[PDB]
Amino acid sequence: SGFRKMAFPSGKVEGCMVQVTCGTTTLNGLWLDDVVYCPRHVICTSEDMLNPNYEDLLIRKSNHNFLVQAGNVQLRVIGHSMQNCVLKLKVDTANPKTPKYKFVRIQPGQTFSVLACYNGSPSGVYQCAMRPNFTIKGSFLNGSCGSVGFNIDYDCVSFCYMHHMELPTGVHAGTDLEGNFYGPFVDRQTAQAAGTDTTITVNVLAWLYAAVINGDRWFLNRFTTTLNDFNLVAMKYNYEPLTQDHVDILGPLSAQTGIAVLDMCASLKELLQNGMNGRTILGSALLEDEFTPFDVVRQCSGVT
Amino acid sequence: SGFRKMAFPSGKVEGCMVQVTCGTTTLNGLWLDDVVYCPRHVICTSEDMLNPNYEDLLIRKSNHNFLVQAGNVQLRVIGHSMQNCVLKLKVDTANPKTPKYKFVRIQPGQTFSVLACYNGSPSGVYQCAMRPNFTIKGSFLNGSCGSVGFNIDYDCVSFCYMHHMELPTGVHAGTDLEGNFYGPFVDRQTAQAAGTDTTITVNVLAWLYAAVINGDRWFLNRFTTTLNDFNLVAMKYNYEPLTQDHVDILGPLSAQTGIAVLDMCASLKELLQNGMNGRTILGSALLEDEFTPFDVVRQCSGVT
Numbered sequence: 001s002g003f004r005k006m007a008f009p010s011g012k013v014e015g016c017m018v019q020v021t022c023g024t025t026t027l028n029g030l031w032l033d034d035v036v037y038c039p040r041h042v043i044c045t046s047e048d049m050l051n052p053n054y055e056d057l058l059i060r061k062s063n064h065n066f067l068v069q070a071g072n073v074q075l076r077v078i079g080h081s082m083q084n085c086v087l088k089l090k091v092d093t094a095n096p097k098t099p100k101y102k103f104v105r106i107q108p109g110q111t112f113s114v115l116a117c118y119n120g121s122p123s124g125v126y127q128c129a130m131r132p133n134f135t136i137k138g139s140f141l142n143g144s145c146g147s148v149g150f151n152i153d154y155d156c157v158s159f160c161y162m163h164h165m166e167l168p169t170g171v172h173a174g175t176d177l178e179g180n181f182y183g184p185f186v187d188r189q190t191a192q193a194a195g196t197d198t199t200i201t202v203n204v205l206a207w208l209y210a211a212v213i214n215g216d217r218w219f220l221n222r223f224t225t226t227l228n229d230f231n232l233v234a235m236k237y238n239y240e241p242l243t244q245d246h247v248d249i250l251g252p253l254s255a256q257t258g259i260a261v262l263d264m265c266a267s268l269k270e271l272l273q274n275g276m277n278g279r280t281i282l283g284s285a286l287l288e289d290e291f292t293p294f295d296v297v298r299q300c301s302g303v304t
Numbered sequence: 305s306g307f308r309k310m311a312f313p314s315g316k317v318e319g320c321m322v323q324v325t326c327g328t329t330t331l332n333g334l335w336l337d338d339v340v341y342c343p344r345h346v347i348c349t350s351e352d353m354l355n356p357n358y359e360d361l362l363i364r365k366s367n368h369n370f371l372v373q374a375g376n377v378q379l380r381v382i383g384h385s386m387q388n389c390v391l392k393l394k395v396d397t398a399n400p401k402t403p404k405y406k407f408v409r410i411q412p413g414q415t416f417s418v419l420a421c422y423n424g425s426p427s428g429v430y431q432c433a434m435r436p437n438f439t440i441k442g443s444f445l446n447g448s449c450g451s452v453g454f455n456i457d458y459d460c461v462s463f464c465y466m467h468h469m470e471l472p473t474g475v476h477a478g479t480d481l482e483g484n485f486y487g488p489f490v491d492r493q494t495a496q497a498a499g500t501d502t503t504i505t506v507n508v509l510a511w512l513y514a515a516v517i518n519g520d521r522w523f524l525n526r527f528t529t530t531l532n533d534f535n536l537v538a539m540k541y542n543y544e545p546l547t548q549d550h551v552d553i554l555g556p557l558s559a560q561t562g563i564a565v566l567d568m569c570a571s572l573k574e575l576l577q578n579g580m581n582g583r584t585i586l587g588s589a590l591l592e593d594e595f596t597p598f599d600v601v602r603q604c605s606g607v608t
């Protein structure tokens with residue numbers, strides 16, 4: 001019993017973190033096989049960051065200008081290329097701790113673990129979601145760039161995020177491991193505003209299921225609704241529209257609890273309209289939206 | 305910027321988790337040097353758990369009755385002893401991944417990371433606090449016993465908790481690594497009720513400091529207070545008394561922000577009396593008390 005915001009165990013990713021230095025900029029790299037992946041802004045002077053021409057900045061850089069340190073041992077860089085907004089540094093040594101891995105591009109509402117690193121050294125692990133506006137609300141200081149987001153499927157690490165940017169509003173932006181930004185963001189020190197940070201409705205519903213499974217049941221009501229009726233109320237409260245695809249994904253939690261998805265929708269509708277009235281659900285005074293249906297099943301079932 | 309409930313990177317502890325089986329009970333063990341530590345209730349049939357005599361149950365057990373598996377390799381048990389509520393199984397192989405480590409007994413209000421394990425396999429990592437009633441609010445299913453709580457100081461793992469028990473209220477109880485329960489709990493399937501789960505005031509104040517450092521400032525008010533005045537209001541709201549020792553510990557956050565500890569107390573006093581009025585602080589609608597002053601400094605400064 002009990003329900004926690006839970007990260008994946010980080011060891012497999014800890015074994016991949018290195019330090020990358022270009023001139024006076026130090027940040028983190030991910031060492032998989034004989035490639036080190038890092039943000040291309042490692043080549044920029046904070047002056048460069050105002051209007052960087054990365055192709056032109058890169059002409060001035062050689063393999064020996066990229067200093068890669070794994071623990072307190074230097075890796076030899078034998079090649080470098082830019083792919084979108086990441087650099088790939090080819091090194092002469094395959095990472096001996098390379099786990100089975102994939103690069104995946106996640107969808108908004110998907111959750112992942114972040115291993116926050118400084119100077120190639122892990123500081124902490126926390127759980128994030130890709131927001132509907134393609135930001136994440138992370139915890140990142142200067143030096144944390146190149147920190148990665150990941151999911152684990154038994155022994156396969158799916159890498160989904162590399163940290164690049166803090167927006168003036170202190171929310172976060174980054175890329176997949178092919179160097180493509182999530183959302184409309186660019187690696188330039190310019191005014192970039194996030195769109196509406198809507199609530200991930202399907203995740204709230206999953207977490208209300210988690211709450212019922214763990215004995216927090218006070219919010220269960222006598223009503224049902226329809227997707228169309230729910231969605232009118234959702235839109236008014238800056239919740240993402242619920243689709244039949246989301247209803248299908250909640251089926252296993254519906255089954256386990258015997259609460260129809262549309263009944264839980266009608267419970268959520270009353271919580272939006274009525275508020276919490278100073279009550280809590282799973283120790284929260286707001287509706288949590290950074291657990292996916294898969295996360296709830298995993299944690300409620302004890303997958304390793 | 306940003307402030308997250310952050311666990312320590314778990315790799316060093318992942319390398320210590322094993323499976324312990326006694327008859328038909330499987331749970332987790334911690335393998336440090338040539339000793340495997342696990343809950344002594346591994347020897348109980350769920351029937352035994354109603355009124356176990358552990359000394360008498362142990363007479364019936366030999367070294368070869370304790371099956372220890374590290375990955376999919378069996379460890380040879382060459383000795384076993386009971387220390388308080390843990391078993392120490394001596395194995396013929398020192399754990400090659402043993403990190404530098406200490407056993408520490410923490411105080412209520414201290415935070416730690418939990419690596420939730422099943423069958424000796426890590427499932428997730430989350431951050432906990434020792435509650436003032438000596439429970440923790442974890443996420444533990446059957447099979448999670450022997451999962452451990454820890455802090456890391458650079459490369460030294462301080463082990464502070466081993467999971468033993470879920471109370472009928474679905475809160476959690478366990479021991480330090482010398483097998484001594486936190487609080488008045490016993491490893492017996494009997495009615496055990498927790499005391500008042502009071503709020504860890506010094507941790508709330510630390511987190512209000514984190515909030516100011518990260519730009520959440522709306523709750524800062526025009527008032528100050530005294531420890532005695534604050535404490536009258538604290539007691540009324542089931543907050544722990546604040547001591548001059550807590551004020552001293554908050555000094556570095558006072559200094560960084562230039563907000564006197566007693567001014568932040570007076571802000572906290574108005575939040576207790578007035579509520580949040582539907583506002584949030586660092587994405588929370590309630591006052592978070594599972595960050596220590598040390599945690600706030602670590603995360604706000606980027607310690608690895």
Ligand SMILES: O=C(Nc1ccccc1)Nc1cccnc1
Nearest residue numbers: 049140141142165166187188189
């Ligand atoms: O954003 C950063 N550098 C940068 C990137 C692109 C444009 C301009 C600047 N660093 C940073 C600091 C704190 C948290 N996360 C990231």
Ligand SMILES: O=C(Nc1ccccc1)Nc1cccnc1
Nearest residue numbers: 353444445446469470491492493
């Ligand atoms: O408490 C458990 N066994 C036990 C221990 C002492 C007395 C009676 C029973 N298992 C458990 C289950 C779920 C979460 N945490 C622990």
